[PDB]
Every structure is written in C-alpha cells, then in structure tokens.
Scaffold this active site. Sequence first.
Site, PDB file in Angstrom:
ATOM      1  N   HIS A  41      70.949  45.053   7.677  1.00  0.00           N
ATOM      2  CA  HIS A  41      70.801  46.110   6.600  1.00  0.00           C
ATOM      3  C   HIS A  41      69.353  46.643   6.816  1.00  0.00           C
ATOM      4  O   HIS A  41      68.562  46.022   7.456  1.00  0.00           O
ATOM      5  CB  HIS A  41      70.617  45.520   5.371  1.00  0.00           C
ATOM      6  N   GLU A  59      82.021  40.102   9.803  1.00  0.00           N
ATOM      7  CA  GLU A  59      81.182  38.936   9.026  1.00  0.00           C
ATOM      8  C   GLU A  59      81.634  37.570   9.207  1.00  0.00           C
ATOM      9  O   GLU A  59      82.825  37.391   8.932  1.00  0.00           O
ATOM     10  CB  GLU A  59      80.950  39.409   7.473  1.00  0.00           C
ATOM     11  N   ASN A  64      73.038  41.934 -12.763  1.00  0.00           N
ATOM     12  CA  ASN A  64      72.555  41.574 -11.412  1.00  0.00           C
ATOM     13  C   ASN A  64      73.322  40.239 -10.766  1.00  0.00           C
ATOM     14  O   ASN A  64      73.859  39.606 -11.374  1.00  0.00           O
ATOM     15  CB  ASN A  64      70.989  41.265 -11.379  1.00  0.00           C
ATOM     16  N   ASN A 102      70.529  36.624   2.181  1.00  0.00           N
ATOM     17  CA  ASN A 102      71.647  35.965   2.899  1.00  0.00           C
ATOM     18  C   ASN A 102      71.055  35.977   4.525  1.00  0.00           C
ATOM     19  O   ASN A 102      71.998  35.893   5.487  1.00  0.00           O
ATOM     20  CB  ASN A 102      72.872  36.839   3.024  1.00  0.00           C
TER      21      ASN A 102
HETATM   22 NA    NA Z   1      74.845  39.607  -0.498  1.00  0.00          NA
END
Ligand code: NA
Lengths: 210, 1011
Positions: free
Chosen positions: B345, B525, B585, B592
């Site tokens: 990200h 992933e 949330n 991670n």
């Molecule tokens: Na996550």
Amino acid sequence: GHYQAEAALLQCTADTLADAVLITTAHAWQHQGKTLFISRKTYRIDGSGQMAITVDVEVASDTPHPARIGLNCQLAQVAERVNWLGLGPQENYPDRLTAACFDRWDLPLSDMYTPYVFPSENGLRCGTRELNYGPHQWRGDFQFNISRYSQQQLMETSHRHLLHAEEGTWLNIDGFHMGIGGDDSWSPSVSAEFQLSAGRYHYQLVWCQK
Amino acid sequence: RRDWENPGVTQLNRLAAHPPFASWRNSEEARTDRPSQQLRSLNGEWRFAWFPAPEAVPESWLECDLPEADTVVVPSNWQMHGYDAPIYTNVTYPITVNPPFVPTENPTGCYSLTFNVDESWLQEGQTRIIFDGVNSAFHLWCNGRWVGYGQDSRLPSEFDLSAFLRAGENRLAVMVLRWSDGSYLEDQDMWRMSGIFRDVSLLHKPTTQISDFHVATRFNDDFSRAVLEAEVQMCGELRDYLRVTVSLWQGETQVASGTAPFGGEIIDERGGYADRVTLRLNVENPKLWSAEIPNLYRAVVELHTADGTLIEAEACDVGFREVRIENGLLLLNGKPLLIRGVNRHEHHPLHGQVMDEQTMVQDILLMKQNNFNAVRCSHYPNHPLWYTLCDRYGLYVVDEANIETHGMVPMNRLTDDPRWLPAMSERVTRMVQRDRNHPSVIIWSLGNESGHGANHDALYRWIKSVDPSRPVQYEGGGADTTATDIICPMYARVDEDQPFPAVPKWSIKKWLSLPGETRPLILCEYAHAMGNSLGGFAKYWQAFRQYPRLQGGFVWDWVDQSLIKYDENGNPWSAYGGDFGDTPNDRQFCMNGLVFADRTPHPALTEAKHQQQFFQFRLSGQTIEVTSEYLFRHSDNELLHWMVALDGKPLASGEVPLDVAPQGKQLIELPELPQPESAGQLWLTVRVVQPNATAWSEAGHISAWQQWRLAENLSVTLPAASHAIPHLTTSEMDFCIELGNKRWQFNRQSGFLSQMWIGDKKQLLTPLRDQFTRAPLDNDIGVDEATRIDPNAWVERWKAAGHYQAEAALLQCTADTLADAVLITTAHAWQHQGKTLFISRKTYRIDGSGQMAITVDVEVASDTPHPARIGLNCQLAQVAERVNWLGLGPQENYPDRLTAACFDRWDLPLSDMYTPYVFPSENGLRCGTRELNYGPHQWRGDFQFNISRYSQQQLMETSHRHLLHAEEGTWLNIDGFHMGIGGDDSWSPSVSAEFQLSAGRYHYQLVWCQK
Ligand code: NA
Ligand SMILES: [Mg+2]
Ligand SMILES: [Mg+2]
Ligand SMILES: [Mg+2]
Ligand SMILES: [Mg+2]
Ligand SMILES: [Mg+2]
Ligand code: NA
Ligand code: NA
Ligand code: NA
Ligand code: NA
C-alpha cells in the site's frame, strides 16, 4: 558400530532416601573412540516394592539415527499369556499402527511373535501403558515386543524354521522405535518424521510384581 | 446535478488518458529524462477550507479567497492536517450501503491556488492541468468559470485550461468530496482519507502534438533478435511535411532510428488511421530486462517537420522482455519465474497516503535487500514515479485497477450489474492507457475482492485485446474464474484445504491438479504478517521450489498502516483503527506489515529474506554444492564465506569465489578441518557476500546463508568431585538449602522456589512457577472481540478452558539429602472448576558445585486445548545491560519461524530482546538455546526463552506499545516447549498440527547456576 558398541561405565552411585533407595547410572557407547550414545538412568526402589526407572539418552548428531531407544533383558520366566493395555491386538509399528486399537489385549505368547520367513525384528506393539507377563507388570508409555527369540538370534538366522526357543523370555521395551518404511525395499524408505533424530530422548517405566 | 451520486457520470470534460508526457522541446533533454520547461509543478502552498457538505460552500469562494481558509501544503490528505478524522474500516463500508447515494453530510475540501501563467503558454498551443490523485471526486473551476469533474482517486484527471487562463495571475478552485458513487468501488482495507493527495501539474503541448504512443518489443526464439514497434498518434492539423522519428538509445549510444510521415496501414473498408504511424526498429542482441538485470534503453519520440524543425518530443524507458504463459508456466524471456513478491500500500505514518520519492526509494531498497523481486500494487494504480523506480531498480509489478467492492452483499452485486460497467471500465482502461509502456509491469489485475461479475469477463477480454503482451489476473469469485490467466488465491494453505461453499481455498498443491486445470498458481496474498507472524513461511517456499507450476506469491503485506498521534506531553505514538474516534473500525487489522510504518523491520522480514534466497545449498562430506536460482545472471558479484565453530567458538574460516551460471551448480570442497580439542557440536555456517556495491546494496551485503551440524563429540568426562556439600534446613514453612554464599528457599505451602540469595542479595521478586499461557498474538485472537466472541480462536479456547485462570494445587513437596546433594521433589495440579488441566512433577537437585538441576515432567489433559507453552517463569530482582546466549538468533524466532535464525553465541542489549509490536503480545522468544547468561545467572539445557521488563500479564492487558511500563527487575520465561505462531491468515486458527503442543506428556531439564 551400533551393533558392536560397548558400554563404558561413567557413573554408578547409590543413595538411601527416607522411603527409598536410589541408583544412578551413566554409560557411554563407543566405537573406535567415537561416542555414539550416552544413557543416564535413575532407579528408585520404594517401600511398595516398585522400581521406577527414568532414562535420558543422548544420541550423537553425526551417527546414523538408531533403530530404537529402549531396554532389553532375558526373563527367567516362560508364561502362557501376554496381557497389555495399548495398541493391538496385532503387531504394530510407529509408521504402521493406524489399524491397531487402544484396548486391553490378552494373547498367547506365540501370537506375540510374527513368523516372517526371513527372521527380523517383529511383534512390536506400540502406545502401551501397561504390560503384564507372569508375575511382572511394567507401566509407562512404551513400545514392546516379547518372545523366545533374542534380537541376536533373529539377526543370525536366515529362515524361520531354523529358530530355536531360547531359555526364558526375551523382552524389549522401547521408549522409542524407528519406522519400518516400505515405500520400496531396496533403498531407505523411512520418512523423516519416523526417524529417531531428536538427539535427546526421555522415557520412564515402573517395574513391579502383580 | 449531484454528479457524485451517479455512476453514469464519472467525469465531465476530462481529457483522454495517455502515458506520461513532458512535452520536451529539446530532444537531448528527452533522451536523458531531464526536467521539461513545459511541465510545471503546482505543488506547494495552497488555500484550504473544510465544509460539512457541498451545500455549505459559499458562492464567493469561486471568485475570491475565503478569509477563513488556511494555507496548507499540497499534496496532502486533509485528515492528516486535523480537519476531520481518518477512518479505519476493513470490509464494512464507511458509509451506509445505498448505491449510488452517499451521506448528505459529506465532508468537502475547498482548495484554491493563485498562480502565474506566462503569455508564451497562451499565445500558442494547449495548457492542461493534471491532478494525479484526488480522493474521491471533485469539481474544478478556473478564474470563477466551471471547467469539469472527475472520479477515480488513483488515476490522473486532466483538463484543458487554454480557454480559461490569462497572462499573469490566475485562480483555481477545486471542490473535493470525501464520498461519491466512486466510493462504492473504493472499499480497500485501508485508512479512508480524502483530498488532493498526489501531484498537481501544468503541461504545455503544441496544438500539433503527440497524443499517444505505445511501445512493444517482439523477439525471435532465442531472444538474440528483437523488433521494437512504436505506434505514435497525433492530434492537430495533418500536414504532408509532418514526420515522426523514433530513436533508441543504450546509454549514450544510439542503437536504432527510424522516421516516417503520418499514415497507417489499411485497417478496414474505410481505410486506415491518417493520424497514426508505426515505426519498427531492428535490434540485434538486445540487452534483456529482468528484475535480476534491469537493462534499459531509452526510446525518444520526436514530432517534427521534414525540414528538421522539432515540434515536440516525448520519451520512455524501454525494457526488452517478453512475458508469456506457455504449457502452464509464467515465463519471462522464456524462463519460468519464481515470484518473491510482496503487496504494498501507499502509506506514510505522518503524511497518510501522500507518497514521496525518498519513501518509495527506501521501500525498493529494503525489498531488494531482503530478496524480493516483485510487488503487487494493492489495490490501485500507484503514484507514477513508482513504475519508473521499478523499471530502473528491477522489480516485477502487478498493476491493479482501483476497483474493490468488498462490503457489498453478495460481493459481486455491483460487478455483475451492467449499469456499473462504465465506471468499472474507466478504472481498468485508463490504467492500461497510462502504464502500458512500463517494462516493470508484467501482469494486469482487474482489482480486488469484488466477487466475480460479467463486468470482469468483459474487461478481462478488453485488456487481452488491446495488450496481448501481459497476462491478466483477478482473484475474485474463487481465484480460478474465466477472468484470470493465473490461479491467484489469497491465503490458500500449502497442504490444508479450506472448502468454503462457492469459493473454496484449496491446498495450493491440490489446486494445480484439479480435473482440467492447467494454469500457473501465484498467490496474490499469502503469509499474513500481522504482529508476531510468518509462522509456516518455510512450508510455502519448499512447495514453491518443488512444484514447477507453483510460481510463488505476494506476502501480505509490506508496511504497517499505523498513523502517528501525539500524547498530552507531545510525544508521538503509533495509532490504529479507532484511535481517531472512528467507529465502526477494525482496530489493529490495519497493521499487517513486514516493516513498521517508519520502515524499521519486524523480525519476520529476516525469515522472508532467508526463504527467498537465490542460492540453494547442499552438504555432502566436506563438499558444499551451491545451486543458482537466478534465471539470467551469473554470480558475478558473489563470494562464499564459510565458518566452522564449536559451540560458538570459531575454529576455522575461509572464502571462495562463486562462479555459478544461472540454474547452474558449483562444488566447493572444504579444506581438512582441525580436530576440536574439546567436547561439543561443530557447526558450519556459509554466507554469500556481495563484495561490490550495487544500485540497491552496499559493499559487503549478505544475500544468502545456511547452517549445518558437522561432527559432534558428546561429553563423557565427569565434573570434579565437589569440595563442599549443601545443607538442608527443614521448617514448617520452608525447605532452605545453604552452600557457601548461596541460599535457596522452597515454600512448603506453595511448593515453589520463592527466593534465592547470593550473599545478602535477593534474586527473585516473584517465585519460580510453571507457565502454560502466553499473552495472545494477533494470530491467537483472530476476529475475536468483547461484543462478538469467536469460540474457534485459540485465545477463546484457552480462556474457556480456564488456562489463564487456573490455580496450582500442591500435591507433593518433599526434601531428601543425597551423598553430595539435596533433592527437592514437587507435584502440582492446575485446575479449573473441578477439571485438572495440567500436572507438573519436578525435582530440584542442588549439588556441592552450586548448580541447581531442575527436571520437569508435565502431563496435559488430552481434552484441554493444547497449551501455548510449557515452561517456567519468574521475575528476577536485577536489571542487567546485556543478554548473552548460545542458541538461535540474533533475532526473535519461534518454532514455526526459526529457519533464518543461526545457532551461535549472541550478545545483545536487553532492549533488543523485546520486539515493540504496536499491539503488544508474547514477543522476543529465541529457540534452540543451550546456554543463557544474564547478570550473575546462567541457565543451561535445551530451551526457548524470552527476557524483558514486561510480564505476560501486562502484555496481555495493554492495547498499545506506548502504554507499556517497565516493571521492577526482569521477567524471564524459560520454555521447554512453545506453540507455533501461525500466520497463514490472522482470522482463523493457522498453527499447523506439527507445531501444536499435543503430545500429552512433556519432559525438559534445566540447570541454573552462577555465571
Ligand atoms: Na488488513
Ligand atoms: Mg458520479
Ligand atoms: Mg532550458
Ligand atoms: Mg490579471
Ligand atoms: Mg477487502
Ligand atoms: Mg537452515
Ligand atoms: Na535374519
Ligand atoms: Na515452482
Ligand atoms: Na563471483
Ligand atoms: Na495485548
């Protein structure tokens, strides 16, 4: 040199406790100056007549993983029945024991020997918590075989019909036993998880009279 | 018109998408990628005002600066400036699910800029504005006049401002909406932010201009010949005197050049493209591009007149490489890839989702230094600079459309709906139009977690049609749909099936051979690196190496998405979901990463580095066999260091040059080793060292290592008969043992060693007691919460069985005197509501040498959940500076994550024995330890340990690392046995059976003595 290894005594002591006598021993098995295995034991004999045996074995990392880690003796007694609480009723080994069931089993002595035409280690029963033979009872968490034939005789004899019952009864009690393999029979076939490669092993047994 | 609540309107007056332009008016500048006078940055100080809804924006703002506005830096996310809260939600949309509508309360960011434009820009040609990233939708005005509208937060929106500008000062006004119909396609598991968060630029192009260009490279069978094909498109007035020249350069050497007038081949019954031309350049023996050797050429595209007047030039880096799937294998330049990948990200702990060159470079360097060769753009097109850096440093890229509809029910509700096809199509097509010339991009992705819909099939085929040079992948709808060339599951396990209805996650080994299946498998992933994780990583890599069609995967993920907050004293701390008042949330699920937000590595990174090594090693006798897993390069910057050590003591070492061909082998015979003069285990360690610096590493960089046990000489010598004999004192309350300056106290009521003295100094603050629990890891917890209990999670199984609440009941506590020692025997039962969970039987033997030998035998009830650990713990009175051990290290390692650790003598400061995971848990364990030294103490045996100023109780009760306080003295946990940490995922039990403590009966032995 596993078959030729001689037990050098490192330690043998005796202590008297409040309700027991304690014997402590240590042995080194060596071949041509190389230490293959070290066995450290305590024997605790108490006022109830029970003998608790604790065994701690060290296996050199660079020696081939041993076939078994256990004890053996030739008992004077020959009894008709063998009674055990463990996996059975048939012969079972660590990598061939799924069919065996945990229960109380009772067989004639002859059934504890498997008459393979070419003699070898045979008749082991695994996951055993209690073994009864004549006046003797062993308790713990062990594998065992019991027969009129020594490992030496089985090793030295080419055909089952040439075997002779020896005096008394040969007992092998293993804390640990290697897999038998069999994916093929012309190359090493025992899978890694069934080889005795842990380096350090612990087991405990209680021997008493029933 | 509320264009932000209409998926049929994704833009108004936006210009076509295209590869990066700079409109050089000098060809040499284009060749060397120097700054262009025609491409101006509008980054810097802008005016900003925040409003609760677009209805609250005053009309005056269009023509005049608001006095209430602040001066802020752009690019930025306005949450990072404190104007409203960032929201961390995983799956659940941050807005009510009611497509295409968004809340009436819709945070609105009003940006403006006063800027100069020179008359030269307006006398001739076209002036456009480029917004590289605006989250999530915006209207644009220039000098009070409305220009246009744009959606898709992750691709550039460009508008022609030529008719809106005047010489001198101009004012832009940009109204940015937090929520739009675009938000329905932007449900990625990340912080939800907004604003003008990527670069803003102004570009001048001539009226007659290059409007698009595509570069392709085709090869002969052995890659010794290539043709570069460049299709060039123009806008403006076609004239016979116009020409396009494409030239190709390798450094300062021109390799090829070609020139043609406009006018393409006949296409159909109506003719061809009069406004296009294709140039074809032959290249003999091209230097091929790969992650191993990122050889680049430069293509310069010149638009000019026949008489040689340059109109403008564009350019790109060219990597000669072919990507194809053949016979079920993904091939690069004819060779099967092994993807050592990671998801990344765009995240910064201070700047949010604003990317800078320095952070991008830092990430790439760390990735390459840790044996990664690939990155997935999870889950959107990246900042344009990212691809340039991957081109030049050498990483394979999966470029992924900004489409995620995870929170929909079912997941494909929008992606199977033809009314959403236009919006989805723009997110895919504009990505391909922008990024198709980058050699680093080897695979296109249709997005993430949006089920499988007919829109996916349509767009899959569109890409295949426009760009046959790259495979297309997509995981949605079960990872093996008709919309993917690659089986690309997320969190499929190596050996274990997870047969979910409709969308099963098969064992990856099984998946490959399902009836009719032929495709390669690369996990999009895997190995979820949340907190103390990456247990079982080695199992993936063993499978990757054994199975041709298992071609690797992308770890989830690179960097923790933690954000910096400041306490009442102004000290920074790492924050996660819920720390900004954001509700609902998903708490710590945003963290991670293999690295912390500031790019400090987690311990798991070294496990990844080791397992992803490019050299494989075997040992036979004294011969080391080195095998290269490189596909293209020889080992021309590598030498092998070897060292033999006896229980950490160096005996011999050497170095040998590595000269290994790609896929080749080298045999290295070690010299005759001198015989060790004492007992113990000899260990061989090899390391591959890069003597020379590279673009991505310093001189002396270690790229690979391995260890083997050599000869062992078991100790057969008895210790000397002691001079003194320990003395036992029996009282009603205690068994006390005395020997010289030493005293041991065993409490007869508790049955534990309650105190030890060396001289007058007490050694313990808490008695030595068995421990069967750990402060739960993120993997132990999963999706378990106070309001929603998940009974399957390890932590809930332990809690329900009473593992954390169990109290010790004393069964036996006796003392005996031996000939040379005192023997204390104990037995305890741990019980919960009448159930005996554990029994611990111990002997303590204190001899005349001052050594205390502890033997422990534990029984664990077969029907209780397997315990986290079987060990002892105590709080030592002392705090010492150093921790010294002989065992696996130097870094934190666990039973299912210890392959990277090496057996040696390690010495670290105490602080390094604690791993500061943002969410605190059991941490800092070191396994396979034979000797531990701390202060005056030494422990010997074969154990796992951790040592820190924080108890398991405190770690268990604390939600954030910054709230931890150092306790008096030092907490020591010494384990005979410790459960695996797992990590195949972090929302279900993932610890493999072989790493669970299921044996029922356990034995370990420790010797405690003075160092
Ligand atoms: Na996550
Ligand atoms: Mg819209
Ligand atoms: Mg200039
Ligand atoms: Mg003016
Ligand atoms: Mg998602
Ligand atoms: Mg290794
Ligand atoms: Na024989
Ligand atoms: Na493979
Ligand atoms: Na070399
Ligand atoms: Na915690």
